[PDB]
Amino acid sequence: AGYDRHITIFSPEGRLYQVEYAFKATNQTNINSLAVRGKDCTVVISQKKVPDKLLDPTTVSYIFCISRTIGMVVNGPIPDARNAALRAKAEAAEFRYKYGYDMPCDVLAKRMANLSQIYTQRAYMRPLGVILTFVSVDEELGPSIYKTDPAGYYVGYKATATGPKQQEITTNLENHFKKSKIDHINEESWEKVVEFAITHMIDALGTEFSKNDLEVGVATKDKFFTLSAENIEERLVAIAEQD
Amino acid sequence: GYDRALSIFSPDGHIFQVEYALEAVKRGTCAVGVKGKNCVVLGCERRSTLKLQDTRITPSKVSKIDSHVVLSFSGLNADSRILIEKARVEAQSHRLTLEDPVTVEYLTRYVAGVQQRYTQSGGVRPFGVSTLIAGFDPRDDEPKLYQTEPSGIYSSWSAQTIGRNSKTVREFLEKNYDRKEPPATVEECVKLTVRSLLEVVQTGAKNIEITVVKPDSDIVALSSEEINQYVTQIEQEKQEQQ
Amino acid sequence: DRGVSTFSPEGRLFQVEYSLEAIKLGSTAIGIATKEGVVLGVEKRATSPLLESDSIEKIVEIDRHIGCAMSGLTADARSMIEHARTAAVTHNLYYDEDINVESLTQSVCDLALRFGEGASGEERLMSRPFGVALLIAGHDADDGYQLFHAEPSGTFYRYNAKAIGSGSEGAQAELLNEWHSSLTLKEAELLVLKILKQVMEEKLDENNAQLSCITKQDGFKIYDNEKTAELIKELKEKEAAES
Amino acid sequence: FRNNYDGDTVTFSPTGRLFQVEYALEAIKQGSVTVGLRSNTHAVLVALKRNADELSSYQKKIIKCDEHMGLSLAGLAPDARVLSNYLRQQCNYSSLVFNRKLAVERAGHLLCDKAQKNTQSYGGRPYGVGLLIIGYDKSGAHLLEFQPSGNVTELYGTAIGARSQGAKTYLERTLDTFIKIDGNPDELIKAGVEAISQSLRDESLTVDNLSIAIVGKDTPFTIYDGEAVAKYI
Amino acid sequence: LKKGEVSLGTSIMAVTFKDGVILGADSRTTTGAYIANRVTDKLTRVHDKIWCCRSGSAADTQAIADIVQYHLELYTSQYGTPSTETAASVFKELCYENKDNLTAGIIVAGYDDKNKGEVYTIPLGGSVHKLPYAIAGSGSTFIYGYCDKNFRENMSKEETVDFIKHSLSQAIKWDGSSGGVIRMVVLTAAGVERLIFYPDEYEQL
Amino acid sequence: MTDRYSFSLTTFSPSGKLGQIDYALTAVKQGVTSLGIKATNGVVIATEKKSSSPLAMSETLSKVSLLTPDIGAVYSGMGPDYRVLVDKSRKVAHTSYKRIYGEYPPTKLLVSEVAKIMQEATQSGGVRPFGVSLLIAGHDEFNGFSLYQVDPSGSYFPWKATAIGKGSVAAKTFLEKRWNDELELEDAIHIALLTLKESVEGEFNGDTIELAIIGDENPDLLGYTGIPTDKGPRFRKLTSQEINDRLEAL
Amino acid sequence: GSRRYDSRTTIFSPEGRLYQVEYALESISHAGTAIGIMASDGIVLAAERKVTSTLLEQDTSTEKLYKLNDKIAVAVAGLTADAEILINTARIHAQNYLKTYNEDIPVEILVRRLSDIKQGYTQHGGLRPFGVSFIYAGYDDRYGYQLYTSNPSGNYTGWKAISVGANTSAAQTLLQMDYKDDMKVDDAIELALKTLSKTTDSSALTYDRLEFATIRKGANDGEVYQKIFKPQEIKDILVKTGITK
Amino acid sequence: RDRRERRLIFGTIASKMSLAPEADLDSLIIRNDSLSGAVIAAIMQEAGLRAVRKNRYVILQSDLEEAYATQVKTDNTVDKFDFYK
Amino acid sequence: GTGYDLSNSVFSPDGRNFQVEYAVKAVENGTTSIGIKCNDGVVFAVEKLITSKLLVPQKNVKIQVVDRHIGCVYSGLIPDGRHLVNRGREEAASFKKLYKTPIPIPAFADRLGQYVQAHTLYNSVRPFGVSTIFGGVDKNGAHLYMLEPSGSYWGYKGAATGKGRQSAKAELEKLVDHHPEGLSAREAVKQAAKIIYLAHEDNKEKDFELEISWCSLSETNGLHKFVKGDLLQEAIDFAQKEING
């Protein structure tokens, strides 16, 4: 044929070079994300930074609202993120007409995975580099987190993290859930759910971040919303109201 | 798309792929055609070494292209079916449309034309076959003998020989034919054809297959019995010229 | 294999250069256009008793006013003829009259451009360019007698005389000295025979040469074996009496 | 290496563009010297026709696209024809659809797009030919320079072919004078011949090499061909 | 056209007020003279504050409406919130190319926060017309005089709810193919509030 | 512009081998220990469940998929190749048989349909071939219970027990010795846990085994509690508690 | 594009060969063995399944024996996968001849088509060919019993005893000697089994390492009834010849 | 190194350095599967050394965990292989 | 490393294909163009290089219109920039017909984005080597956007690209701070002209001809128009006053 990394075909070893390099250096773009599940919400915190004072940070987007209710958190670069967004959006909409029902996280995950795989076998396309975390509060499962990753592999989570502070986030939640004997915390108001998230975040990444350095996306039953800049400071001050 | 290159120039103004097509023919079996002025004889090898072949369903080297026209070859059988099929269709196409029996020149142009296409056109390679095409034009008693190469070129020849040891059989034939006095009788032109093809088959008198074409669809394949007789005779001739 | 779009630092394509190499290996074709005709002559060559030498010729008729003699690969000149007949026939039906020899060369040269992988400008269906160059000779009622040299590269020039083939370097040089602007059809044919004799390593017979002519009361006319030989018979004696 | 990025037309290289593209710009200089000049009411094209021999007849270096338009080539011939047909097609359709002649500017921008498409296509190639396209539309007199990678510039005057820089020095001096003569054809024409013979330095000029074409406010596409260029030297 | 029809209440309208636009329609389907559904929904969402009133055949309108839903979800998300003008055009485009097999009479009425309430009327062959308030269906004709006199500027929310209730109740009386429940959707800066009146309510009111 | 790739990416090497099939197989050897047993009173297939994360669902994860109602498949190889392949196998099985002959394809016939997908993909360029091997374990009422192997190229062969993945040969030895036909399904479940304990060490549970059987019926697997008309599924995947119960049963 | 991202192995060689074809025959010479003995009251077919086990089924004895018709069947030497596409298409090519003329295809036509498809994969497309060689076990009323072999190159030859697969060389050297020019089925069966043992290393020749089919005329079975021997009928014939050792 | 084998190496290095009833082996058996005897000894030794440079005298199961997690990676690679997750 | 310098159909370990790097480089190798967002609008200005008096003013402006209210200017290579725009135009005509509304500046960013990104999933199509700064006023506010050649793009408050990118961001960043966003659209022409002047200091081998255009909802009424006449002429003077030399 050609070679195993000038076109996409098996390696000597049965590996795929392109999928493993797609895992690595697409999360080192100054991005770190976590998603945790509420009681009647789903919270995402994700880093999101602007290096100029001349770059309007509103257009800067890496939590997208796929539908009115669906969110998708992308870890990886904006050229890739919009190829996956266009696909996601289209899939969401199509689903809504044809099957008469709102798009579940899991179905979207599964569909996108199989598609990426096909593009992985192709000798004139690449797998996208992006890692896609699809969030809502389904009325067919409660709060949900389902994540696809780039190899055509995808799997459901109850809480997930990405970027190399994966270990830190996990351990804090694991110990906590083993003690309380639940993997979802119980609290109604979204506000208290974001405070729970921050607590585990601050400890784990070992830092706190500004309003414009964060972006927080909240899933609720039949809405997904992003928190304004003042709204993200309100929460950071509110734990410090306690202190 | 697989209309892209698969046949490229040489720097010498040949084509690599046509030079390599001719080699397969040489390794191959030998076919010959020798002309009288009443017939055209075609000899074809059937050198069965092994005795476990059943030879009524072991492929022949003689095809009808038309009822008054034959094609013989030396080269890969697999490729030759593909050419043989397109050439039968073309005889019937003329017959249908012109209301006329087929003329030898046009068929030769056709055989030449498919091979010529596949060198010129991309994502195809030429056939592994050289052919001899012979027959008689309608209402005509003079012999016709054409040679085509998988280059796609074409020529007429009074006699021509192809495949393995082409040199040896040309060289011999050249001493036993003149255009000014070619043979009138079937027996002596056949004697000459069997004698050339003896000298390269090694042992053969059932391994040599003669088919003699007289004007307009009198096409008759001589048998082993008959051939063994000419070989005896040739062994008598070679101690009358000692 | 070899690029189909890759040029030399000068900017002359590899494929074009390679086209020029096959041309130089055929047997000479020589044309002189005069004021009463166009003469096209070829060396057919080969004489054998196992060869039918007067059944093969290199001067083929396109139309009742157009011939071509070739030099180079002969198999290639069959595709060029198939395109050329179709184009001329369709124009005679639409406007009832002769097609121009320059016009024909351009229509053919357009399909000489395909080779290789396709373009988005053009669908390239072939694999190599044509390895034969041609002298196309004709008559039209609006420029009289003419002679044209088509190169497979794309360039076509009108000439009053031109030689192509292996032995063209010598041949052309002779053409100029012999050429003048009161040259006639009958002289030109005799002269052709002189040139052909000179450059042969053999005796000139009509089973190694063929003549042809154009007169406008008969169109493109092949000077037959019987007439060509009578002309050869007359040559040998007259030359062999200047010594 | 050279051989690494050369094989197909789909690769960029650290230079900022592909090697092959530069080789297409280089070919133009090989082919025929053609100068382009305009005043503001007429625009003049002067071209040297070359052949190969004594007994060869000239190849035309002016191809008339319309009865108000024509162009000169310099460089590779076969592409210059494939382009002149496209321009013919573009022209006609404009007239059939929009009743429109086809502006020089308008044509340039369509031609550019066609050129990008054939430089992203891998089997495709740069054309390897530059063109000086002249016209008088209702935009005024025009000269455009077309390059076979999609570079289109509107100019007062320019040259492509043998010592372009050569002619350009001449034109840049005599510029201010000739361009303000507006309403006299002959002067601008006379400046064209005066220029072209000084670019030359290993060739000479003669009557039947030269061919002049003028288009303008009162000159519909007209060629002075052979003999009739004598009266502009 | 197609093959098969379900017939519909054939009295729809959108009337604008101060706080936006209120859309109102009657719903009741029949197949023949058989009452397929007493209670039905003819108020269909294409966007969150932008609904439409479906008229012609049920079948044709649904098939179009799906196509419009699909485009408008993707517009919303990507290009920002739609307008009624944006909807109106999608409805027209399909309708005009497919006028020979579909038949759709649509009033698209929407509430925007950048152009307020908007009414775009799509004719049965397919056209885009803005009008200040619109009446469509085949019972609108009888109620042209009433709506124009009492249609007045800067209406109060109740006064417009009475006005639409009255408009449709006179049309439902005189017209025969009209009947069943009145559904309405009040489209304001406060959301969409949905009202339903059973047969016994509007007749009196 | 656009693709032009039509040249086969699977080609012959000087020995008579096919580079792509050789490569793909290395992946399969390194893949998760899977086996299949025909108990004669059923068929039991077991495969390793795994978790990515403890905070990760493994409900979504697919290690045992039902290809058609009475038939399950399990694999060793490349997970993404497996997922797409299952899909094309499900589709053709439903369209071309389930109201044409009025029932599911027979096991051997379904193994051939998979075989074809993989072979199309090996012949043709634009795409590399599938990198997978399957164990298709089944029941069809016209062949009983069956076990097949499907290779990466699409070569298949019949088996009555096997294992593929890492540590195959020894796994087959324990299975060969313990089972020799005419055996309860339950008993084959017990044997299967024993073969895999010896095969996998470091930590072992029934919460890291995912077990499916084809070898039961419930009324719930006719899919209705009324009056029969047909037989229906016999695929049943067990929950983790039931598997721990069979681990407790000696 | 694809020029420098691909190669051309479907071109000729400086001997006149094609790379992939020559290689394809090699693939076949280490695959399992198929043997064809044509008799004049029958066809005897034998195949060795190289390696058999009690973990494989040995019960399926169509593993290399496929019927393409009730009058033509092939014995396969090479891959199952490669085999599958030509079988399915051959069976289809049958039905077409059958529909058109209401009569079954001769063997020879069906071979010539097969070979043309196989030539085709190296002739255009850039594709790879199959890597499986077929032995045609077949009928005509023009030619009696027929025995062919066709190859991935697409050359095809008439036989009355042939082998392809491994150990070809050993089987054919014994077979040519012990051949009788016209012979009955039962005699063929004795000859075959005798040859078979001494082509299978050490004590290994068993019924369950063999696939056997015979095609007999019968007189409780129809003219040209193909019997594809299932285990138990192999067990019988081995004991009768006594060759089980 | 099989499971009984790794277990010993954690214990033997763990004797040599500070330890307490927190120095939970059960955790560790999941964390390490079959790395050479060289590698297990290397890591256990380094983690006691690294804790003490972070200005901790005590070693706990917590302490080994925080040292390890830092050394093992600094880039993010998603699960294990492409063969199974 | 390698394969990623010729292709885009496979993924670099650096996360950034070497061919993509070369595309950015040709952008910095063009001219300066900039874009200024203001409190009602956007103003665009470009340095047009003067080489010879054989070039004609305002026919080789590098400002090209799309729709009615989007002005598009670029740095890099001319052919890439025009083809990219011609595609924008075609999508824009399609847009207008279908949705009966003008094409957004955010929409157009996406349209361009998807054409570039498409050519960065394929080795068989070669992408664009220009950064295009564009913007306008629409139904949903004023927008400045910059499209970079990866298929990365965002909305900015201010933008520069080209040779003079750095000097331009400096001079812009001071002026934007001083103002709330860039004050009035009138003011913005004067400000622009200062930015071009500072950006010229990286050229100094060619003279320049100043060309500005604007799109303003308070002094153009939502249309893209050139800034010429009096307004351009006061702007040359303002630049030459404060910036000396």
Whether there are 3 or more C-beta pairs closer than 8 Å between F and B is yes
Nearest-Cα distance to chain F for I226, in Å, is: 37
Q: Where does chain I have alpha helices with state H?
A: 18-28, 78-99, 105-118, 165-178, 185-199, 230-242
Distance CA C19, CA B14 (A): 10
F23 chain-H contacts, CB cut-off 8 A: none
Which whole-number Å values give the CA distances from I165 to I34, I152, I195, in the listed order? 8, 17, 10
In whole angstroms, what is the distance from residue E39 CA to residue E179 CA? Answer: 10
Q: Which residues contact I86 (CB under 8 A, 6 or more apart)?
A: D109, D113
Q: How many CA atoms lie within 13 A of I50 on its CB side?
A: 11
Helix (H, G, I), strand (E, B), or coil: what is residue I72?
Answer: strand
* Amino acid residing at G146: Q
Is residue A49 less than 8 Å (CB to CB) from chain I?
Answer: no
* F131 to A10: CB separation less than 8 angstroms, yes or no: yes
Are the CB atoms for I199 and I159 separated by under 8 Å?
no
* E-I interface (Cβ pairs under 8 Å ≥ 3): yes
* Whole-angstrom distance, CA of residue F165 vs CA of residue C110: 59
Q: Which residues of I touch A21 (CB under 8 A)?
A: 11-13, 15
Angle at alpha carbon of residue G146, lines to G142 and G149, rounded to 5°: 135
* One-character DSSP codes across C79-121: HHHHHHHHHHHHHHHHHSSPPPHHHHHHHHHTTSS--SS--SS
Any idea which residue has 């979207």 for tokens? A108
Alpha helices, DSSP H only, in B28-76? none
Residue F186: enclosing H or E segment and its boundaries?
helix F185-199
Chain E residues whose C-beta is within 8 A of a chain I C-beta are 75, 78-80, 83, 85-86, 88-90, 92-93, 114, 128
Rounded to an integer, what distance in angstroms lies between the CA atom of residue I101 and that of residue F196? 66
Alpha helices in I100-184 (DSSP H): 105-118, 165-178
Q: DSSP letters along B83-105, please?
A: HHHHHHHHHHHHHHHHSS---HH
For chain C, the maximum distance between any two Cα atoms, rounded to a whole number of angstroms, is: 66
**CA neighbor of F136 nearest in space, from F216, F65, F60:** F65
Pairwise CB contact (< 8 Å): I124 & D10: yes
- How far is it, in rounded angstroms, from Cα C191 to Cα B88? 47
C135-152 as b/e: b if 16+ CB within 10 A:
bbbbbbeeeebbbbbbbb
Distance from the first to the final alpha carbon of chain B? 67
Nearest-CA distance I186 → chain A (Å) = 21
Please tell me which of the candidates H65, H73, H83 has its beta carbon nearest to residue A164. Answer: H73
The CATH number of whichever domain residue B139 belongs to comes to 3.60.20.10
**Residues on chain F touching C120 (C-beta within 8 angstroms):** 1
Region class of G20: left (phi > 0), else alpha (psi between -120 and 50), else beta? alpha
**CA distance to A179, B164, G156, G160, per residue, from G33 (Å):** 66, 33, 18, 17
- Of F49, F71, F45, the closest CA to residue F175 belongs to F45
Sequence-distant (6+) residues with CB within 8 A of C183 are C32, C34, C35
Separation of first and last alpha carbons in chain H: 23
Domain G1-244: which CATH number of 3.40.50.300, 3.30.750.80, 3.50.50.60, 3.60.20.10: 3.60.20.10
Contact check, Cβ <8 Å, C2/B8: yes
Q: Give chain C's domain count.
A: 1
d(CA D177, CA D188): 10
> Testing the interface with F: which of G25, G50, G79, G132 to mutate, by most F Cβ within 10 A?
G79
Could you tell me how far CA F106 lies from the centroid of its own chain? Answer: 16
Give the residue among C215, C54, C57 at the shortest CA–CA distance from C139. Answer: C215
Q: Output the CA–CA distances (angstroms, integers) from residue G152 to B87, D108, F116, G17, G140, in the order listed.
A: 24, 56, 19, 13, 24
Instruction: Answer yes or no: do E79 and I100 touch at CB < 8 A.
Output: no
Contact pairs from chain G to chain I, CB under 8 Å: 6
Chains C and B touch (3+ CB pairs under 8 A): yes
Which listed residue (I31, I120, I132, I161) is catalytic? I31
Say what the resolution is, in angstroms: 9.3
Is D156:D141 a contact under the CB 8 Å cutoff?
no
Task: List the domain boundaries for chain G.
Answer: 1-244
Q: Measure CA F38 to chain center.
A: 13
Tokens of F151: 């290779």
**Residue G216 carries which DSSP code?**
E
Nearest to F66 by CA among F247, F245, F234: F234
Gap between the Cα atoms of A135 and A158, Å rounded: 11
How far is Cα D211 from Cα D46, in angstroms, rounded to an integer? Answer: 6
Burial of D133 (0-12, 13-18, 19+ CB in 10 A): buried
G228 is written with which tokens?
A: 């594809």
Give the β-pairing of C38-43 and C209-215: antiparallel
Rounded distance, CA G210 to CA G229, Å?
A: 10
Enumerate residues 6+ apart whose C-beta is below 8 A from H18.
Answer: H48, H57, H58, H59
Can you give the residue range of the structural domain that contains I95?
2-244
The SS3 assignment for E144 reads helix
For E114-143, the DSSP string reads SS-EEEEEE-SS---EE-SSEEEESSGGGG
The one-letter amino acid at H37: G
- Find all residues with CB under 8 Å of F164, minimum gap 6, and list them: F28, F31, F34, F35, F76, F133, F135, F149
The dihedral sign for the CA sequence I155, I160, I165, I167? negative
Distance CA F61, CA D53 (A): 79
Nearest to residue D70, comparing CAs of D16, D172, D144, D15? Answer: D144
Residues in contact with G195: Cβ distance below 8 Å, sequence separation at least 6, in sequence order? G35, G171, G174, G175, G178
Whether G4 has its CB under 8 Å from any CB of chain D: the answer is yes
- How many residues would you count in chain I? 245
Flag if C1 and G8 touch (Cβ within 8 Å).
yes
Q: Which helix (H) or strand (E) holds B73?
A: strand B69-75
**For residues E67 and E92, what is the distance between their CA atoms, to the nearest angstrom?**
12
Which one-letter amino acid corresponds to residue F249? A
CA angle H32, H37, H39 (to 5 degrees): 65
I31 is a catalytic site residue: yes
Report CA-CA distances (Å) from G221 to C22, D197, G43, G157, H24. 68, 102, 15, 30, 78
Strands C132-140 and I153-155, sheet pairing? unpaired
Q: Residue B139: is it exposed, middle or buried by C-beta count within 10 angstroms (0-12/13-18/19+)? A: exposed
Q: Do C8 and D81 touch (CB under 8 A)?
A: no
- Starting at the earlier edge strand, list the strands of the sheet with G210-216: G161-164, G34-38, G42-48, G210-216, G225-228
β G225-228/G65-67 pair status: unpaired
Q: Tell me if D215 sits within 8 A of D69, measured CB to CB.
A: yes
Cα G191 to Cα A72, C97, G205: the distances in Å are 74, 81, 15
Strands (E), chain E: 11-16, 21-26, 29-31, 34-37, 43-47, 50-56, 104-111, 117-122, 129-130, 134-137, 182-188, 191-197
Is residue D42 within 8 A of residue D190, CB to CB? The reply is: no
CB neighbour list of residue B91: distance below 8 Å, 6 or more residues apart: B65, B66, B69, B102, B107
Q: Order across the sheet with E134-137: list the strands.
A: E134-137, E11-16, E21-26, E182-188, E191-197
Q: Which of H65, H75, H79 sits opposite A28 (nearest CB)?
A: H75
Residue C111, amino acid: L
- The radius of gyration of chain H's CA atoms, rounded to the nearest angstrom, is 14
Nearest residue of F to residue H35 by CA position? F202
Give the Cα separation of A162 and A165 in Å (integer): 7
Q: Which has the closest alpha carbon to B44: B204, B158, B183, B151? A: B204
- Nearest alpha carbon to residue E165 among E188, E153, E181: E181
State the Cα angle at C9 between C4 and C10, rounded to 5°. 95
Q: Is G2 on the interface with C (CB under 8 A)?
A: yes
The CATH number given to whatever domain includes residue A30 is 3.60.20.10
User: Using CA of residue B67, residue B73, residue B78, residue B80, what is the dihedral sign?
Assistant: negative
First to last CA, chain D: 49
DSSP alpha helix (H) spans, G58-164: 80-101, 107-123
Residue from the list C4, C113, C157 with its beta carbon closest to the beta carbon of D78: C113
Residues whose CB falls within 8 Å of the CB of residue F225, separated by 6 or more in sequence, listed in order: F219
What is the four-CA torsion angle of E55, E61, E64, E65, rounded to 10 degrees?
80
- For this PDB entry, the determination method is cryo-EM
The CA-atom distances, in angstroms, between F178 and each of E55, F39, F173, F181, F192 are: 74, 11, 9, 10, 10
Contacts of A28 in chain I (CB under 8 A): 15
Selection from E39, E28, E65, E29 nearest residue E50 by Cα: E65
Map C169-202 to HEC letters.
Answer: HHHHHHHHHHCCCCCCHHHHHHHHHHHHHHHCCC
Q: Which amino acid is at B95?
A: R
User: What DSSP letter does each residue of D178-197 carry, written as one string?
Assistant: HHT--S-HHHHHHHHHHHHT
* Residue D108: closest CA among I209, I26, I77, I59: I59
The answer to whether chain D touches chain C by having 3 or more C-beta pairs less than 8 angstroms apart is yes
Secondary structure (3-state) at D47: strand
Distance (Å, whole) CA D81 – CA E148:
69
Helices vs strands, H then E, count in chain B: 6, 10
List residues bridging with E15 in a β-sheet. E22
Whether the Cβ atoms of residue C212 and residue C40 lie closer than 8 Å to each other: yes
Indicate which CATH number applies to the domain containing D220.
3.60.20.10
Q: Which residues of C touch D25 (CB under 8 A)?
A: 11
CA trace torsion C62, C63, C66, C67 (10° rounding): 30
**CB-CB contact of C25 with C72 (8 Å):** yes
Beta bridge pairs of residue E108 = E52, E120
Q: Exposure string (b/e) for F68-90, b if CB count within 10 Å is 16 or more?
A: bbbbbbbbbbbbbbbbbbbeebe
Which chains does chain G touch, 3 or more C-beta pairs < 8 A? A, B, C, D, F, I
The CA-based angle D102-D107-D109, given to 5 degrees, is 145
Cβ neighbours of F153 in G, within 8 Å: 79, 81
CA triple I173-I178-I183, angle to 5 deg? 100
Q: Is the CB of residue B162 less than 8 Å from the CB of residue B45?
A: no
Measure Cα distances from H1 to H4, H30, H40 in Å.
Answer: 8, 13, 9
Sign of CA dihedral G130, G135, G140, G143: positive
Assigned token pair, D153: 């510039």
Query: Which residues of F lie inside 8 Å of C (Cβ-Cβ)?
Result: 1, 4
Contact residues, D window 115-154, toward G, CB-based 8 Å cutoff: 122-123
How many domains does chain A contain in total? 1
DSSP string, A140-205: TTEEEEEEE-TTS-EEEESSEEESTTHHHHHHHHHHHHHHHT-SS---SSHHHHHHHHHHHHHHHH
The pair of three-digit structure tokens given for residue A66, joined into one six-digit string: 């796929």
CATH number at residue F102: 3.60.20.10
Q: What is the DSSP letter of G208?
A: G
For C104, other C-beta atoms within 10 Å of its C-beta total: 24
Counting other chains too, the contacts that A119-122 makes at CB distance below 8 Å and 24 or more residues apart are: A120/A8, A120/A16, A120/A18, A120/A19, A120/A151, A120/A152, A120/F80, A121/A8, A121/F127, A121/F128, A122/A8, A122/F126, A122/F127, A122/I9
What is the edge-to-edge ordering of all strands in the sheet holding E43-47?
E43-47, E50-56, E104-111, E117-122, E129-130
Q: What H or E segment, with its residue span, contains residue F242?
A: helix F240-248
How far apart, in whole angstroms, are the C-alpha atoms of residue C109 and residue C120? 19
Range of the domain at D30: 3-233
Check whether domain E7-205 has CATH 3.30.450.40, yes or no: no
CA distance A231 to B186: 110
Quote the CA–CA distance of A1 and G6 in Å, as a whole number: 5
Is residue I99 less than 8 Å (CB to CB) from chain F? Answer: no
Residue of A nearest to F88 (CA): A114
Nearest C-alpha in A relative to G4: A2
**Sheet containing D210-216: order of strands:** D157-160, D34-38, D42-48, D210-216, D219-225
- Count Cβ atoms below 10 Å from residue C225 Cβ, excluding itself: 14
SS3 D3: helix
d(CA D147, CA D145): 7
Q: Which of F49, F30, F63, F39 is nearest to F144 (CA)?
A: F39
d(CA D114, CA F173): 69
Active-site hit among E10, E40, E86, E103: E10
User: DSSP label at G56?
Assistant: B
Residue from the list E78, E83, E93 with its beta carbon closest to the beta carbon of I101: E83
Contact G3 D122 (CB under 8 A): yes
